[PDB]
């Protein structure tokens, strides 16, 4: 069921400070094309973690995710939940800017999903720890992500550890009379956070 990213169970070896956060649910239409979030940025200016990541400039944590979409038995389609480390938006054309690369809690959208906006084709995106949300089998997906970085610490504001992508591969078709949009809610919980140094 659950998918350990590379099999770690993230422990830690600077104090050691777990509420289930809930991002705001995106609506999924017929002509939608995907989303991405770039953790651990979206937890900033939010909650007690936001007061622990904005003032401290060393950081290490691991996460537990739960992507869950609720659909009735009269819809169809299949998503793709992948967790990409060091996920870099390329920029078309000419650099992409700042409000495109750090979207905050409102996760930004894609332009060209076939190349993942980085020249990397989607056919091979399953190297990353993936989990198919197929709407005729289940309605949930759960990924546990350890702390994946070369240096054992970093700043919380600048460097993003990884990203989370949600891509509609097969488009949503529905007979007339049903609701047009399907929500997608996400749950984020830090597992073993360990901050250091106060400013």
């Amino acid at each position: 069921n659950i998918v350990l990213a590379y099999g770690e169970w993230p422990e830690y070896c600077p104090t050691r400070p777990n509420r289930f956060y809930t991002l705001d649910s995106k609506m999924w239409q017929e002509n939608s094309t995907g989303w991405y979030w770039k953790f651990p940025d979206v937890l900033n200016k939010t909650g007690v973690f936001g007061q622990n990541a904005q003032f401290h400039y060393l950081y290490r944590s691991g996460f537990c995710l739960h992507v869950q979409c609720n659909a009735s038995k009269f819809h169809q389609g299949a998503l793709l939940v992948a967790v990409i480390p060091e996920f870099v938006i390329a920029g078309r054309g000419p650099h992409p800017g700042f409000t495109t690369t750090f979207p905050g809690t409102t996760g930004a959208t894609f332009y060209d999903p076939y190349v993942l906006d980085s020249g990397v084709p989607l056919s091979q995106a399953l190297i990353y720890p993936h989990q198919w949300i197929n709407l005729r089998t289940n309605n949930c997906a759960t990924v546990i992500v350890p702390y994946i970085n070369a240096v054992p610490f970093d700043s919380a504001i600048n460097h993003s550890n990884f990203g989370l992508i949600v891509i509609p591969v097969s488009p949503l078709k529905y007979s007339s009379g049903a609701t047009t949009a399907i929500p997608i809610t996400i749950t984020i919980a830090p597992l073993n956070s360990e901050f250091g140094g106060l400013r």
Binding site: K73, H75, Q76, A78, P113, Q124, L126, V169, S170, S175
Partner: protein, 167 residues
């Protein structure tokens, strides 16, 4: 690593719609849904998967590839498919009957949502198809179109030989 295989690589595909095989609801029984060669390295369907890129290196390959499908319809739909296979001696079959005599796997929809198929001992063709073998059945107030995306991987005895630069 099972990666997504491009099958609908026609001219008018143009986007994410080339990652999926259409399944109608008006096709008469035994008409070929899709067909492609089992050739990790030749210019075609396998050129998008992870096997097809790391076998543009390593000139001589040998092993046992497997092919996985999965279905993307509503929960109420019900049908069958006949995933067939032929050895590389002959071409693809013509009818459902002359394809039934091979290495078929009668895969349906109400029970299973995914199926695999083990292809034995390729070297440096071999053709896989899939046939309808029944109607596609829907209840009312249900969209009657779905897609089948394919996969691709290599099992344990897949070995390589002399290195070679790519493209």
């Amino acid at each position: 690593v099972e990666t997504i295989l491009e099958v609908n690589n026609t001219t008018e595909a143009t986007g994410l719609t080339r990652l999926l095989i259409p399944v109608s609801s008006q096709n008469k029984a035994d008409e070929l849904c899709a067909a492609f060669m089992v050739d990790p390295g030749r210019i075609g369907p396998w050129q998008s998967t992870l096997v097809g890129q790391i076998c543009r290196y390593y000139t001589q390959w040998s092993g046992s590839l497997k092919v996985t499908f999965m279905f993307t319809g509503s929960f109420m739909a019900t049908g069958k498919m006949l995933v067939a296979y032929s050895p590389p001696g002959s071409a693809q079959p013509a009818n459902r009957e002359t394809a039934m005599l091979g290495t078929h796997v009668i895969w349906d929809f109400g029970l299973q949502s995914s199926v695999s198929l083990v292809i034995p001992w390729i070297s440096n063709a071999g053709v896989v198809t899939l046939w309808y073998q029944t109607n596609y059945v829907v209840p009312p107030e249900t969209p009657g179109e779905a897609y089948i995306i394919a996969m691709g991987a290599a099992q344990d005895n897949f070995t390589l030989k002399i290195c070679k630069d790519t493209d």
